Amino acid sequence: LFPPQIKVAATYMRGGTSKGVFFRLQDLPEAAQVPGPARDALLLRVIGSPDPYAKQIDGMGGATSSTSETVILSHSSKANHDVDYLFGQVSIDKPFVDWSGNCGNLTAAVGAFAISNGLIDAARIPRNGVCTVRIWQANIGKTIIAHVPITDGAVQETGDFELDGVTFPAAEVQIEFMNPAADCMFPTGNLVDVLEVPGIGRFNATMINAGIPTIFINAEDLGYTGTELQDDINSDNAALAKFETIRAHGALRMGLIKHIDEAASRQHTPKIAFVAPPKSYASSSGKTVAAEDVDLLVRALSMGKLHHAMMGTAAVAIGTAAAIPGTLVNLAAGGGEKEAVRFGHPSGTLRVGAQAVQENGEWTVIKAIMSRSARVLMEGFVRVPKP
Amino acid sequence: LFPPQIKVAATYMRGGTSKGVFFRLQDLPEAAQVPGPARDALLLRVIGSPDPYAKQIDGMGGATSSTSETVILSHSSKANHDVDYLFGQVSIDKPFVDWSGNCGNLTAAVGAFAISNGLIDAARIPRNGVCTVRIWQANIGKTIIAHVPITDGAVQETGDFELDGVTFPAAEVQIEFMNPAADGGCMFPTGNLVDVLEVPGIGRFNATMINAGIPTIFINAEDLGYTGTELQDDINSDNAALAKFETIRAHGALRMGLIKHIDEAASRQHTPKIAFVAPPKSYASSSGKTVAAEDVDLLVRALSMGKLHHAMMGTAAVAIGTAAAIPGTLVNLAAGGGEKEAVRFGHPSGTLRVGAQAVQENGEWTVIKAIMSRSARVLMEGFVRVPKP
């Protein structure tokens, strides 16, 4: 006989409320330097998947969607970009890596990794200040900007900026998702649709493609209040099944898939989320989120479970939808023109800015913005058995 | 002024059904090279604790007891030992690292780490074959042996040996826990093979309390209304059940003499362990595989740090094998009674075989050793980072 494990240079990082394994493209084994089965098999093995035990005890994964994540970065040859970014959502249970979406939380870590690993021109890095990293999000074909603080020519990781869902403070990293609307913001052409879901019921829904394709429904239409924590939903098999059926049909209605059964393998996109007007609740850390602290409540699912905080991509979808009068998100937030919203999720709150402009009946959004943070947890070499 | 993070050389490994962060003593910052608050603070931050979110998203931990684990290894000064092993169980919710126990699953990884990191006399490492690593378990003062395979002067990590609860095969590493009975000491601190554990207002529970591998309270599944086939989802979302187990564990700790006041159990979470046992019965494991009644001698489920464990703690496996070898314990009786040189028990992830050699001496039981096979592999090697202490 059994050959030794191979070593692959890698960095394990927290970005926002997620953890991922990061690779320079050139550090991957040659076979994995192009998309396909060899790359996917390698990433699966690094993470510890597929795992019928659902624990990822034999890999780098943490057995949750927000800890079963891989990133491949390279210097970009594209005009006006520094770094090319591929995000792979590694299935816990299936031998599958999903490449259909971005990861918003890891974006801050992408910027930092790029700087620390020479993927941006040295001339673009100030000695002290803020380095603006232009990221080509290669999964979805979008520009994202990470403003990473620099001290003495190196990434400033540590700091006093707090994120709800991140245990310890770190340096603030401002992110900007440019032109988030898919090249349509509303695939159905409607702000709100009646989603026909065979076997479940009829649901008013806003389906938006900004940040990530997302289906928003009202909490009350599912018997929820919007203050739910993970334990209220993630042990409820019937409830989880209801959510998945809706997501599948939404995917079809959005024209993301050609047929309903594609949703079985395509778990990662679209996302499904429920919204509610402000209401006070204790977050997962025990801290009180007061109704006055937020504009609305949003809970989202990822890979079949209620997410512990909020996906960064879904935060973009929330901010963008809130800015367009008449979406379910906008209405949950009290209606009107909104240039930003702070929403309550299970771990606390998150503020996203998105200014929309109307001209000739159409709504456009130049960018959605939010702050995150990132830090290296471990750097060196991951090992897997010889492929 | 927010200084850069410090870097500490470390290796992240799977050992058995657990993951932990491993350090050579000499690689630690000076202040952390002795037991104390500086060491504990470093390890807490590496793992991502204390974490009110209970997710450990800001460290190396995986938000379960079997993935919130640290190990410090050093050259031994003990006669006939190669390496000293300290295990730190890192609390998820409190700023606390518990040093009162061993970790059995990580023992195979300890052997491998020691060989790979210059802690073993080169004369004892063959170019090819088996390196017998003599480990001084410094938490509990016991000898443990790891037979680590060697190829081309390096640890042979990969192989075809499978463990239930470990996703992928690897090289078999046989482990031997020498003289596992404690010197709340003695093999049976109450002096009885079975006791009646009185928990006023909660129940009366027949129990075997044994100190071998780790102090452990065994009760019969049926006395709790369980069958022994339970999986994590049957217990870990049941706050009533978890509270009941904790009260029983506290009363067992008091009865064993491990604590003097019942309230001490709140801070002393790591030891003793509590487990429940039953005769063989068929069930689907957490992976979906059927464990047939014929495949096992008994069923055992254990809790660790207030949750049903996903597989079995290696220390508790030693307690199971040892108790099973002593005729009349609840474990022995669940396995059909009589002398028993080994048992295969069913846990939530499948089965585990443990052998324990019990021999009479002066009309009293002695247990020479307990043995089992595990495996280990490096997951990531390099440097962990934390903000400057």
Author numbering:
A (entry chain B): 5 to 187, 194 to 397
B (entry chain A): 5 to 187, 192 to 397
Q: Which text from the study accompanies this structure?
A:
The 2-methylcitric acid cycle (2-MCC) is widely distributed route of propionate catabolism in microorganisms. That is, some prp operons lack the 2-methylcitrate dehydratase prpD, but rather contain two other genes, acnD and prpF. AcnD has aconitase-like activity, whilst PrpF has aconitate isomerase activity. That is, in organisms that use the AcnD/PrpF enzymes instead of PrpD, 2-methylcitrate is dehydrated by AcnD to 4-methyl-cis-aconitate, which is then isomerized to 2-methyl-cis-aconitate by PrpF, and rehydrated to 2-methylisocitrate by aconitases.
